[PDB]
Amino acid sequence: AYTTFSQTKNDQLKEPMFFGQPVNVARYDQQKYDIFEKLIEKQLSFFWRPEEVDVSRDRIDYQALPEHEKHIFISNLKYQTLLDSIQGRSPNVALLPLISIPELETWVETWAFSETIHSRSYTHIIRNIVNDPSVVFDDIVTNEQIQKRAEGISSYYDELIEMTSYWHLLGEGTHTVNGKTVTVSLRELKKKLYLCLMSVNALEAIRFYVSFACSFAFAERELMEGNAKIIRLIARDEALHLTGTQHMLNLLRSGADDPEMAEIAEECKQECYDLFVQAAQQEKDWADYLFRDGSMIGLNKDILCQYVEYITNIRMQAVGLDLPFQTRSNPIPWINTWLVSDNVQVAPQ
Amino acid sequence: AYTTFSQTKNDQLKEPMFFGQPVNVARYDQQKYDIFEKLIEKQLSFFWRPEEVDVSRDRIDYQALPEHEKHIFISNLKYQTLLDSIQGRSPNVALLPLISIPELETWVETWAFSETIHSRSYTHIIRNIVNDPSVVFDDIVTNEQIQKRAEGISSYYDELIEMTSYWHLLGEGTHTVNGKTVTVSLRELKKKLYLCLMSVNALEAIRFYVSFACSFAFAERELMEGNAKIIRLIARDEALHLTGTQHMLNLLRSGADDPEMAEIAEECKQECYDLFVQAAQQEKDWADYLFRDGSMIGLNKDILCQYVEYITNIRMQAVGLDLPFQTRSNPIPWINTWLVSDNVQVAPQ
Numbered sequence: 001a002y003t004t005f006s007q008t009k010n011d012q013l014k015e016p017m018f019f020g021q022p023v024n025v026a027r028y029d030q031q032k033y034d035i036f037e038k039l040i041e042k043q044l045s046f047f048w049r050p051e052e053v054d055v056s057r058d059r060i061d062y063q064a065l066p067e068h069e070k071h072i073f074i075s076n077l078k079y080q081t082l083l084d085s086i087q088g089r090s091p092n093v094a095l096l097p098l099i100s101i102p103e104l105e106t107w108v109e110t111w112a113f114s115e116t117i118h119s120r121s122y123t124h125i126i127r128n129i130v131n132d133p134s135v136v137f138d139d140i141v142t143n144e145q146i147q148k149r150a151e152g153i154s155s156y157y158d159e160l161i162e163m164t165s166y167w168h169l170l171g172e173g174t175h176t177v178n179g180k181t182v183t184v185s186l187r188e189l190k191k192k193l194y195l196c197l198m199s200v201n202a203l204e205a206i207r208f209y210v211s212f213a214c215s216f217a218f219a220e221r222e223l224m225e226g227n228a229k230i231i232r233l234i235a236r237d238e239a240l241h242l243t244g245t246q247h248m249l250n251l252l253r254s255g256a257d258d259p260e261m262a263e264i265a266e267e268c269k270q271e272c273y274d275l276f277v278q279a280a281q282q283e284k285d286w287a288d289y290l291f292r293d294g295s296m297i298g299l300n301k302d303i304l305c306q307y308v309e310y311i312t313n314i315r316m317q318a319v320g321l322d323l324p325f326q327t328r329s330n331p332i333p334w335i336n337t338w339l340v341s342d343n344v345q346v347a348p349q
Numbered sequence: 350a351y352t353t354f355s356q357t358k359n360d361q362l363k364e365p366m367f368f369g370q371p372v373n374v375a376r377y378d379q380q381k382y383d384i385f386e387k388l389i390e391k392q393l394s395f396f397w398r399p400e401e402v403d404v405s406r407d408r409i410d411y412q413a414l415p416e417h418e419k420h421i422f423i424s425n426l427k428y429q430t431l432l433d434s435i436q437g438r439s440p441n442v443a444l445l446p447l448i449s450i451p452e453l454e455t456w457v458e459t460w461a462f463s464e465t466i467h468s469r470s471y472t473h474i475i476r477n478i479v480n481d482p483s484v485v486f487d488d489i490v491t492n493e494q495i496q497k498r499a500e501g502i503s504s505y506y507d508e509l510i511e512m513t514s515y516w517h518l519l520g521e522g523t524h525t526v527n528g529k530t531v532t533v534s535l536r537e538l539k540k541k542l543y544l545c546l547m548s549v550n551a552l553e554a555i556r557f558y559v560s561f562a563c564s565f566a567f568a569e570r571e572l573m574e575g576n577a578k579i580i581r582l583i584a585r586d587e588a589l590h591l592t593g594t595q596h597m598l599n600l601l602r603s604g605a606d607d608p609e610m611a612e613i614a615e616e617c618k619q620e621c622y623d624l625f626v627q628a629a630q631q632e633k634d635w636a637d638y639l640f641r642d643g644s645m646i647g648l649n650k651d652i653l654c655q656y657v658e659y660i661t662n663i664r665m666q667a668v669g670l671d672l673p674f675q676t677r678s679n680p681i682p683w684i685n686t687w688l689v690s691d692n693v694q695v696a697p698q
């Protein structure tokens with residue numbers, strides 16, 4: 001019962017963010033939640049094209065890198081390309097059919113779109129620094145370490161999408177499908193959404209920031225500077241994206257938007273804390289992979305793992321979760337130079 | 350029959366460089382070979398003290414280096430310290446008792462002295478960048494790779510010294526020592542000297558220049574810059590030292606100084622070519638050791654081995670030997686910035 005133009009004239013200011021009447025009119029003169037309208041406007045104001053950035057001198061730098069420094073750089077680039085391949089499509093496929101207010105629907109489409117620009121930018125970098133991009137793009141799918149991350153991350157989306165389809169096709173209840181039981185529960189579907197959004201928040205707010213530290217470590221060395229110009233633009237967008245999901249999560253758990261979500265967010269608080277901790281442990285294990293053949297000036301496994309803990313505590317606090325790690329100061333304060341924009345706070349605070 | 354003041358009033362302008370009457374009067378108003386007087390004057394004009402150089406910021410750089418870059422740096426430093434531990438004492442112990450003209454005798458003492466300043470400078474660097482210098486100094490003696498080089502290099506000196514003592518004690522002839530035959534031959538002793546000087550030429554002209562490339566590669570990266578200031582001073586001295594032995598070798602083989610040496614140099618020309626080639630192969634194997642855990646920006650095994658071939662051809666040509674390697678251009682032209690002085694040509698030409 002998904003409908004691309006629902007016929008009921010409903011008050012869009014009183015719909016929940018999710019699971020209400022699907023959005024009919026796209027109107028932008030009023031919002032339930034003006035954060036999403038502000039995010040659209042910012043993201044539109046940031047519009048950039050990757051070919052705006054000259055990455056010519058990055059091919060020379062990359063060829064000069066010792067083999068383990070190529071390994072750090074190219075592994076980081078492949079991981080980012082994986083993540084925004086997923087982020088390109090997934091917010092649209094997974095969330096659009098669930099959204100019941102226009103500002104959020106348009107934010108999600110704007111968000112996903114901005115991710116396709118990131119993917120396009122990773123292609124621009126790749127084709128400029130290697131002789132055969134196919135090798136790189138194929139390794140994104142087959143690489144043992146990258147695949148493990150792809151599998152976990154994609155499962156949050158995939159499960160929400162499948163359950164969403166059952167909800168739209170069958171509605172709430174207990175059902176018979178080819179002689180087996182299928183229980184469709186809005187409460188469970190709400191839990192799937194909440195976890196998926198927690199996972200997407202950890203992806204943009206933690207996993208990509210770990211990756212930024214790697215890119216900007218090269219830039220600190222005055223290497224791969226075209227790459228770094230692009231990552232500055234990407235990071236400025238990412239700051240919006242993670243703000244968007246922090247607001248979605250916080251509005252859902254407060255009870256303001258849907259009192260039932262408040263109880264659901266409370267039920268699965270341990271599951272969320274665990275998902276976040278798991279993501280952080282995975283980014284630390286990724287550090288171990290990046291640096292398994294040696295580190296470089298200014299960044300190694302120990303430093304990068306401290307940064308994982310530092311940023312994870314900040315991001316978890318922002319969505320109301322307990323801190324998993326000891327308090328610590330920023331282990332790499334130089335990163336804040338690269339994570340700065342006049343029109344949004346790009347660095348964690 | 351070594352005498353510290355020989356009583357015969359001899360014409361010092363007609364003595365050979367070596368094996369003549371030991372020098373009585375040290376006079377500097379005339380020379381047989383004014384190259385040696387020019388070298389003394391230059392070396393005196395270059396006099397420096399290692400504490401003139403601030404190496405404080407090298408401790409911070411060294412601590413920031415990844416472990417394999419520490420390995421490159423500290424292995425290179427240990428090898429240099431080994432070489433000038435030997436060069437500090439060895440020219441004096443091995444050549445002074447053989448010298449029969451005053452300008453050469455004083456050049457050798459000035460040379461050896463300048464080497465003690467180099468050793469003192471390596472102590473200055475070591476104690477400033479590590480917490481426990483004893484570990485470093487002990488590893489110079491025990492390190493498998495360094496010891497192999499020490500053994501070969503020291504043998505050229507040690508054999509000349511032993512034979513020299515037999516010559517001084519027993520003179521030319523066939524002798525009985527504790528019931529065995531000892532043949533003392535001036536011709537063989539002359540051959541020992543010539544080979545030893547060929548070995549010392551390869552040491553200063555090739556082995557130390559390979560090492561300079563390593564030091565200056567860090568400086569190109571703006572790392573270990575105090576070390577590099579010291580190496581610039583050391584390299585300026587080394588240019589004199591190798592000039593000194595190029596002249597000794599060339600004057601000996603031309604017949605000008607001792608017609609018999611000319612025939613001896615011709616006899617053992619293959620042995621010299623082989624010694625040089627061996628030294629070069631050893632410096633290439635050393636490159637393989639330096640970079641066994643990874644290389645760094647601007648210098649790796651392949652580049653350093655090209656530089657070994659490039660400099661070896663130049664140095665071998667300068668002492669009349671055939672070139673072992675294909676013609677090639679300087680693989681690291683940036684090194685010539687560091688190897689430059691207004692008052693001597695420091696870089697190979």
Ligand SMILES: [Cl-]
């Ligand atoms: Cl307005």
Ligand SMILES: [Cl-]
Binds near residue numbers: 320
């Ligand atoms: Cl809270």
Ligand SMILES: [Cl-]
């Ligand atoms: Cl004069």
Ligand SMILES: [Cl-]
Binds near residue numbers: 668669
């Ligand atoms: Cl010649």
